[PDB]
Symmetry: C5
Subunit: 217 residues, 5 copies
């Protein structure tokens, strides 16, 4: 109807994710070869999201409920790529070793695994939340004062601005999901749909903007 | 049948939108890198429209009625991109700051939100219509004598002609929708389908024409 | 079965239209930027046809009958593009004003509208047929001795040969449809399906041939 | 099950045809503009096959039986393109008139039409088989010592090797289908599925190999 | 549910394979013409997998059980391409005859055929396993000290590193499947799904990495 505001959000975010996927896959012509992968991922991320969003919608239509499990699946598939985007832009703008890529991947996977263990009752909720937040804070530290920051200090000002915007997205927009787990273990689907709009579309648009700016200039 | 003239329009506009989407995504080869995004959007707009048009048709088949709500959804997704097209062509033809982009986006979002609030009964119909028309007139003023006009005054004559045609489209073709809300709060689906044909296909064709002309010349 | 020869034709023409759509959209790599649009349209035409052909097949399977109305819909969408192809090849080979484009579009639309009015009983059959044939003959005259002929006289011999072949297609292959209306207002689906094979696939292949020849040479 | 070996073949050939279609449409980047069409066709052929293969599978699932009629439809669509491939490679490697294209098209169409007339009982089986085999042998002669051979004698050794391999495919792999008609008018679906694997995938791979070799060298 | 861990894996691997297919087909822009085919295959492999994975999921939903037979079908289609990847990278980096390609293809086909004969009871399980493992070991030897190793010794260090990583993947990740047949003839679906994740996605990513590195450098 006009009062649930959940199915509607579902449709809005689904169409926006489809459009973002097509946009990121099409706008690789405006960027150099070094930024193509970055854009490819931005597109894959949004495409995976859409795919899973579709299934969340089918399950919601059949028996309305939370797709948390599926939302751990998509997350399992998309959060690693979103955290790799930092390594991709650093590799396209300067010299980065790849140990940053490995440690970011490990941190994101550990965070998601412990979050799911807390969600399904396999592990105690408070320790699982603590370990997930520790992995999240470790990723934040690696992007703030670690290998990522050291590699970013040797990049152009446009790349540095994009890196700062992406880091602030990781700090604040990603903070919604741990706030949800906290609240749920102590509406949600609508908040998660909107969260994605920024986390997946605005993130990719920041990457696309810096890539197009660098390739033109 | 042959007398409703509504489902038929639905099929006509749906096929035209599909064709326009493919055309805009394919004809990016004829334009320079500066115009590619403009064409990408023209394609995304028409594509989103088609997508939502499909759902409007399924809902009409199941239980015939107005898709207003969905038509606020697609609009919510397409009107910002259509109003961004001005910024995109100005950026591809001359130097434009981006404050124009921000203010156009804010104005379009405010207009659509107040229109929906008037449509759903959340807010009083007359104040909602007044605020929506004020946002529309503010966008018209920004394109007529504001930052958009100032940026257009430093462009080539072909870009100026395209900008004037797009502005007149915004003034007149977009005027149909507030006329509908007025009439409905004081046939409609057919008028809205035809409205789109011009607002979404002719708009994109004007953009495509100016982009191809500039890229060849 | 093996005796209707109608559903079979439907499948043959549907697959041929799909293959032609893919061929035209793919073979734009072999042509210069000036001919890309021409090929894009040839592809869109065939694609729209396929789309509508699909629906004609669904309706025929559900309740076998004539899709005339839908066949006025697709025609409404494809005949303008087919007649525009003349303007597109003239623009890609020489200087043509565009008044030719406008007058061809108006003539084709008037012809189709009056044909539908005669088909649905809105207007008297004989006057509607007379007006439609007058619009058709006016288009033929414009292509034979008018602005189209004047623009074609200043083109390369290959473009002139393609223009003559397309004009003879317009004269003879398009003559089937008025012969059908005459016969029906004084088998048909099979004749219309075959008609399309030449009108839509051979037309586009003539355009593709001249475009590839000019781009290579 | 695991003993029919027909539905399984169907799945194997369907997936292989899909993969070949994608491969041929994608690998046009490795070839020059002169070979693009050749690859386009190789792709269209496999794509049409897949399309029709799908329907053959739906009909087999609904009421298991021979899709001969449909197999005359696809053949009607694909055999002309496969026999045109000779003209396409000769045109991309040397000067060929096009009378070869016309006579190959006529011969293939006559062969298929008489084969279907013999299959449906419209014409006597033995005369229809004789006329079809005469058309097939005429095509073989035109490729062996006719205009095709004359054009091939003025080509590079790689093109000559590809032409010889394609001609031997026409002689031997195509010989399965007349052997089937003979046997059936005096298992089969499995033999026809495998036949296609070579006739449609190996043929296109020979064309792709020679095109890539010539374009690189 | 949340305890089967099989259907979930199915969804995870299906989405990952789709994403990998799109990634490998899209990232051909970053590589030279010599590596395009390599990437094309990496994409086709993953694509075919996805396709078959879909059907495995439909069969599992309808009547839950092992898709071994279908898993011999996809394997029949994908293992040859995966083993051809060695020849493709060797051809894109140095001079390789093609006898390596032929012998690898024959070995993979023999291995799969004997494995299926052991699985279906056509041939005795122990002799079929012995012959399949002999073919596998022959392929390993050809890649370790045969024509493949001889061709790899004359390649750049990056290509040699990629070749070594792919060879170790063949040695260890491919060892899961014979270990399954052993265990089943003396959980499995989950192990096979994960096996694929590495065998099909990591293999293609190694190829993509070396191709992009060589093309940029
Ligand atoms: C597109 C989806 C995104 C970006 C999801 C991000 C999710 C997280 C950052 C989740 C984090 C969690 C913790 C930090 C600890 C508690 C459990 C989680 C999984 C909710
Ligand atoms: C493709 C759809 C388009 C371009 C839709 C445009 C819609 C508008 C300009 C709607 C405007 C309205 C007002 C100005 C005030 C009253 C309420 C609205 C939302 C109908
Ligand atoms: C792909 C479809 C094509 C090219 C259709 C062409 C249709 C016409 C040229 C129809 C012409 C008619 C008249 C000239 C007068 C009588 C009514 C019509 C609409 C049948
Ligand atoms: C992909 C399908 C192909 C290449 C089919 C080829 C079919 C033929 C060469 C059929 C030939 C026949 C004759 C030569 C005479 C008897 C009847 C036919 C149609 C079976
Ligand atoms: C994507 C699928 C892949 C890479 C599958 C690989 C499968 C094998 C290497 C199977 C090997 C077998 C033997 C070596 C002997 C016993 C039977 C088989 C077929 C299980």
């Amino acid at each position: 109807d006009a009062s649930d505001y959940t199915g509607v959000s579902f449709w809005l975010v689904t169409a926006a994710l489809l459009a973002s996927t097509v946009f990121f896959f099409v706008e690789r012509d405006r960027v150099s070869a070094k930024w193509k992968t970055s854009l490819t991922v931005s597109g894959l991320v949004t495409g995976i999201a859409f795919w899973h969003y579709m299934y969340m919608r089918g399950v919601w239509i059949e028996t309305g409920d939370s797709p948390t499990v599926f939302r751990y699946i998509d997350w399992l598939l998309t959060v690693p790529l979103l955290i790799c985007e930092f390594y991709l832009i650093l590799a396209a703008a300067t010299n980065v070793a790849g140990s940053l890529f490995k440690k970011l991947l490990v941190g994101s996977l550990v965070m998601l695994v412990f979050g799911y263990m807390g969600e399904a009752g396999i592990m105690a909720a408070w320790p699982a939340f603590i370990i997930g937040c520790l992995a999240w804070v470790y990723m934040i530290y690696e992007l703030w004062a670690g290998e990522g920051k050291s590699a970013c200090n040797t990049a152009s000002p446009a790349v540095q601005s994009a890196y700062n915007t992406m880091m602030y997205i990781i700090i604040f927009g990603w903070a919604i999901y741990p706030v949800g787990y906290f609240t749920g273990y102590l509406n949600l689907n609508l908040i998660y749909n909107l969260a994605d709009f920024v986390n997946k579309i605005l993130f990719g648009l920041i990457i696309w903007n810096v890539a197009v700016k660098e390739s033109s200039n």
